[PDB]
Write an enzyme that holds these catalytic residues in place. Structure first.
Site, PDB file in Angstrom:
ATOM      1  N   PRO A   1       0.841  -1.234   0.000  1.00  0.00           N
ATOM      2  CA  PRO A   1       0.000   0.000   0.000  1.00  0.00           C
ATOM      3  C   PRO A   1       0.850   1.247   0.000  1.00  0.00           C
ATOM      4  N   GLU A   2       2.190   1.095  -0.014  1.00  0.00           N
ATOM      5  CA  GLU A   2       3.098   2.266  -0.148  1.00  0.00           C
ATOM      6  C   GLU A   2       3.608   2.395  -1.576  1.00  0.00           C
ATOM      7  OE1 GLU A   2       5.782   2.695   3.338  1.00  0.00           O
ATOM      8  OE2 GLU A   2       4.269   1.679   4.506  1.00  0.00           O
ATOM      9  N   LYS A  53       1.732   7.468  -3.896  1.00  0.00           N
ATOM     10  CA  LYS A  53       0.766   6.530  -3.433  1.00  0.00           C
ATOM     11  C   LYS A  53      -0.551   6.542  -4.263  1.00  0.00           C
ATOM     12  CE  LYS A  53       1.882   6.328   0.977  1.00  0.00           C
ATOM     13  NZ  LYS A  53       1.754   6.416   2.461  1.00  0.00           N
ATOM     14  N   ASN A 175       4.233   3.755   6.506  1.00  0.00           N
ATOM     15  CA  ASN A 175       4.735   3.399   7.814  1.00  0.00           C
ATOM     16  C   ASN A 175       5.888   2.390   7.781  1.00  0.00           C
ATOM     17  OD1 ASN A 175       4.494   3.731  10.646  1.00  0.00           O
ATOM     18  ND2 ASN A 175       3.479   1.760  10.660  1.00  0.00           N
TER      19      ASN A 175
END
Length: 264
Positions: A1-2, A53, A175
């Site tokens: 998801p990055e 992203k 993250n």
DNA sequence: CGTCCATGTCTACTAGACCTGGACGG
């Protein structure tokens, strides 16, 4: 998801659709609060590219396709569980919220945007999101200048581990990458962003790693696009022997050693 | 059976809110 995942997803779309022709409408699940996609064409090809992203699909009718159609672009954000799959038309995965159907000659496929938690979004318009900074993978230099012209911004008052999530300046960093990035320069996560950034302009440095670290992940390949290759690559995020804390916004930052001056 | 945790925004009155589900604990 990055960022590297979005970039792998767009190369997945491009390679897997290289020799496909789609047709029909663009179908959305009834549960998805995202817009319906007004597009029909008897024959169209799909392509993609990524920026930070976000990922952009382009839908491209072949010559002579019916309904007349001009090329259409859609921009997707993936949230925590977005992905793109190519599956057989009748064996759709659970949570396939948007789908593009191959047209006949060969086996009937569907390209699906697949999103379990529904955190992902899309939008009509092919436009990137307007406050997003440049892509740390694909627009390094611009990324680097944008950060350095703007250290006065109150974003940089925050700890470095938080500023690194701010997509206005680090479009593409999430993250896991902040953990990994910081850990390679042993910069405490709660050091102050402006201080770590003056001390750069205004042995690779923090901004240089923001490009080269996610580029490493892209070079491992994989991700649906092999997961032990990645768990192997990780030196910090989630790893045994690492400390971790919650930032202001409840997100876990993994690290080693000094938490840093602005710790909670 | 239940609690906690996850590669992100988004929106509204920092702090939930949005969502499914796997790992684990009792």
């Amino acid at each position: 998801p990055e960022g590297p995942e979005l970039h792998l997803a767009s190369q997945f779309v491009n390679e897997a659709c290289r020799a496909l022709v789609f047709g029909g409408c663009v179908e959305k699940s009834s549960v998805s609060r995202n817009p319906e996609v007004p597009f029909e064409s008897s024959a169209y090809r799909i392509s993609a590219s990524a920026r930070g992203k976000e990922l952009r699909l382009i839908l491209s009718p072949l010559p002579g396709a019916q309904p007349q159609q001009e090329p259409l672009a859609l921009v997707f954000r993936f949230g925590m569980s977005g992905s793109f799959q190519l599956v057989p038309r009748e064996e759709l995965p659970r949570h396939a919220h948007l789908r593009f159907y191959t047209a006949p000659p060969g086996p009937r496929l569907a390209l699906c945007f697949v999103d379990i938690r529904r955190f992902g979004r899309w939008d009509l318009g092919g436009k990137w999101q307007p406050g997003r900074g440049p892509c740390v993978l694909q627009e390094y230099q611009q990324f680097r200048e944008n950060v350095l012209r703007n250290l006065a911004d109150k974003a940089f008052d925050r700890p470095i581990c938080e500023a690194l999530l701010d997509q206005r300046f680090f479009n593409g960093i999430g993250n896991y990458l902040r953990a990994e990035i910081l850990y390679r320069l042993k910069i405490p996560p709660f050091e102050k962003a402006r201080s770590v950034l003056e001390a750069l302009q205004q042995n690779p440095d923090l901004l240089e790693l923001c490009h080269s670290v996610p580029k490493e992940v892209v070079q491992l390949g994989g991700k649906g696009y092999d997961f032990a290759a990645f768990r192997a690559w990780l030196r910090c995020y989630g790893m045994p022997g690492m400390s971790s804390l919650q930032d202001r916004h409840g997100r876990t930052i993994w690290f080693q050693g000094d938490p840093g001056p602005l710790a909670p």
